Amino acid sequence: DLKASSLRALKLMDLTTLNDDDTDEKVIALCHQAKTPVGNTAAICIYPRFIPIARETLKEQGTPEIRIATVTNFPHGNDDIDIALAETRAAIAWGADEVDVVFPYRALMAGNEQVGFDLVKACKEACAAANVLLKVIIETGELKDEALIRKASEISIKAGADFIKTSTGKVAVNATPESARIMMEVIRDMGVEKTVGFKPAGGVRTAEDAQKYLAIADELFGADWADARHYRFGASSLLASLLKALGH
């Protein structure tokens, strides 16, 4: 059971390092770790300034198709569209393949549904022009309430999110199976399973955890649905756990 799930999960990872003090050496090591004896991860996820060195490293190890994701409006999800859009434009200029933007979840909690639409839509228009995929982090662990998780997911989808993502990994509570079910049910209910992927991020630690998340996807959308365009794990230590489950 865990061998099959761990293979699938490894090739869906956005292998991540997002620390206040990351270095080129740490990003280089991360790129090397993304090329495993059983597969490449789907992507790496790093701060924008590291995109050039990561791209070089990925090319020089012969894995040019590992995608490079980054983050914007991060981790705060503030409601200043000009700043979020400037950061998204800078991430595109740094060379990102994918931008994971934080939704203005505290503004939503205060009753403003419109700013989240306008922020996501502006970032989507910049990314789409550059053929860059946009993921939207709603911060389920701070929204807390099921109705709010559903609403943030719905606004993000309406505004053009290519993925909805649970969490930044920078707050106390990140992905859970409960939150994942709620968000994937929104994808289902809105009829967007073909065009909107799901990404649990933070707190996915073990091969057993990953197997749970994939079981929800398979139940809701069928076993064929999850793939790199539709599913990612935002994770780090998970990779060593998946490799261990696979005998490496």
**DSSP string covering 70-125, please?**
EEESTTT--S-HHHHHHHHHHHHHHT-SEEEEEP-HHHHHTT--HHHHHHHHHHHH
Six-digit token string for 112: 């403003």
Count of other CB atoms within 10 angstroms of residue 206: 17
Beta strands in 103-225 (DSSP E): 133-137, 163-165, 197-199
d(CA 245, CA 238): 11
Torsional sign, CA 242, 227, 48, 122: negative
Helix (H) or strand (E) run with residue 191 in it: none
**Resolution of the deposited coordinates, in angstroms?**
1.2
Reply yes or no on whether 100 is catalytic: yes
From 124, 135, 151, 165, active-site residue: 165
Reply yes or no on whether 218 is catalytic: no
What's the structural domain count of the chain? Answer: 1
From 97, 100, 162, 209, active-site residue: 100
Six-digit token string for 1: 């059971």
Contact (Cβ atoms closer than 8 angstroms) between residue 183 and residue 155: no
From 124, 135, 151, 199, active-site residue: 199
Torsional sign, CA 144, 116, 95, 48: negative
Contact (Cβ atoms closer than 8 angstroms) between residue 206 and residue 238: yes
Six-digit token string for 239: 């990779």
Residue 53: give the domain boundaries: 1-248
69 forms beta bridges with 45, 98
d(CA 247, CA 123): 42
Question: Can the peptide bond before residue 48 be classed as cis, meaning omega within 30 degrees of 0?
Answer: no
Helix (H) or strand (E) run with residue 245 in it: helix 238-245
Provide the CATH number for the domain around residue 98: 3.20.20.70
Six-digit token string for 13: 């990872």
Six-digit token string for 232: 């990612």
Name residues whose C-beta falls within 8 Å of residue 108's C-beta, 6 or more positions apart in sequence.
Answer: 115, 116, 143, 148, 151, 152, 155
Reply yes or no on whether 79 is catalytic: no
How does strand 43-45 pair with strand 39-40? Answer: unpaired
Contact (Cβ atoms closer than 8 angstroms) between residue 67 and residue 55: no
Q: How far is CA 125 from the centre of its chain?
A: 19
What percentage of the chain's residues is helix, strand, coil (to nearest 5)? Answer: 50, 15, 35
Nearest to 187 by CA among 214, 210, 166, 164: 164
d(CA 69, CA 195): 18
Nearest to 166 by CA among 191, 198, 134: 198
Contact (Cβ atoms closer than 8 angstroms) between residue 119 and residue 103: yes
Beta strands in the chain (DSSP E): 13-16, 35-36, 39-40, 43-45, 67-72, 98-102, 133-137, 163-165, 197-199, 233-235
Six-digit token string for 125: 């228009």
